[PDB]
């Protein structure tokens, strides 16, 4: 197993 | 084999322990992107990890190399117990970070309802804005999140009462 840091959201919409 | 950033990130917490015995003061220890095993551990939702690490030694406050946080890591995921532990150590509820926001904004985004309850009830300033100028009132208003939108307009009517 290996995972991946997730991203901070992207405020666009 | 894994990196102590991997045990964490994976909830491998009996390896994560064999790791700290044998290293020297490892436990803050940057990976390439500044992330340190709590970071990672926070952003994963790992809850008994988060609390070995914080009980180890491991600095909750620490920002990776784009200001990325444990905090909010654990609000974008919307996971609210580590959220709780993070807060319990004073970590600011309202780091900012060049993504655009913060952990109440991230909360927001994601339509994570019990976050948002939480980092209300924790403090969060209301009028901290992204980068984009918008509040998190006008981020629940303008993305349409009416449960979202109703617990900020319960907590803001608390603020004014003694």
Same mark, same amino acid.
């Not at chain 2, 994976?10 to 390439?32: A, C, F, I, S, T």
């Not at chain 2, 008994?48 to 909750?60: I, S």
């Not at chain 2, 927001?108 to 100028?133: F, I, M, P």
């Given at each position: 197993?290996?995972?991946?840091?997730?991203?901070?959201?992207?405020?666009?919409? | 084999?894994?990196?102590?950033?991997?045990?964490?990130?994976?909830?491998?917490?009996?390896?994560?322990?064999?790791?700290?015995?044998?290293?020297?003061?490892?436990?803050?220890?940057?990976?390439?992107?500044?992330?340190?095993? /709590?970071?990672? +551990? !926070?952003?994963? =939702?790992?809850?008994?990890? $988060?609390?070995? @690490? &914080? *009980?180890?030694?491991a #600095?909750?406050?620490?920002?990776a190399?784009?200001?990325?946080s444990? /905090?909010?890591? +654990? !609000?974008?995921? =919307?996971?609210?117990?580590? $959220?709780?532990? @993070? &807060? *319990?150590?004073?970590? #600011?509820?309202?780091?900012?970070?060049?993504?655009?926001?913060?952990? /109440?904004?991230? +909360?927001?985004?994601?339509?994570?309802?019990?976050? $948002?309850?939480? @980092? &209300?009830?924790?403090?969060? #300033?209301?009028?901290?804005?992204?980068?984009?100028?918008?509040?998190?009132?006008?981020? +629940?208003?303008?993305?349409?999140?009416?449960?979202?939108?109703?617990?900020?307009?319960?907590?803001?009517?608390?603020?004014?009462?003694?």
């Amino acid at each position: 197993a290996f995972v991946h840091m997730p991203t901070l959201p992207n405020l666009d919409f | 084999s894994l990196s102590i950033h991997q045990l964490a990130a994976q909830g491998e917490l009996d390896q994560l322990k064999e790791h700290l015995r044998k290293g020297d003061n490892l436990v803050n220890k940057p990976d390439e992107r500044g992330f340190t095993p /709590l970071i990672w +551990a !926070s952003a994963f =939702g790992e809850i008994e990890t $988060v609390r070995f @690490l &914080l *009980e180890w030694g491991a #600095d909750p406050h620490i920002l990776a190399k784009e200001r990325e946080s444990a /905090l909010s890591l +654990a !609000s974008t995921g =919307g996971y609210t117990d580590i $959220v709780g532990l @993070l &807060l *319990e150590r004073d970590v #600011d509820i309202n780091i900012y970070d060049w993504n655009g926001g913060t952990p /109440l904004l991230y +909360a927001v985004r994601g339509n994570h309802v019990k976050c $948002v309850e939480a @980092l &209300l009830a924790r403090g969060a #300033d209301l009028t901290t804005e992204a980068d984009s100028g918008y509040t998190p009132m006008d981020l +629940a208003v303008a993305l349409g999140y009416r449960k979202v939108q109703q617990v900020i307009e319960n907590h803001i009517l608390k603020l004014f009462q003694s």
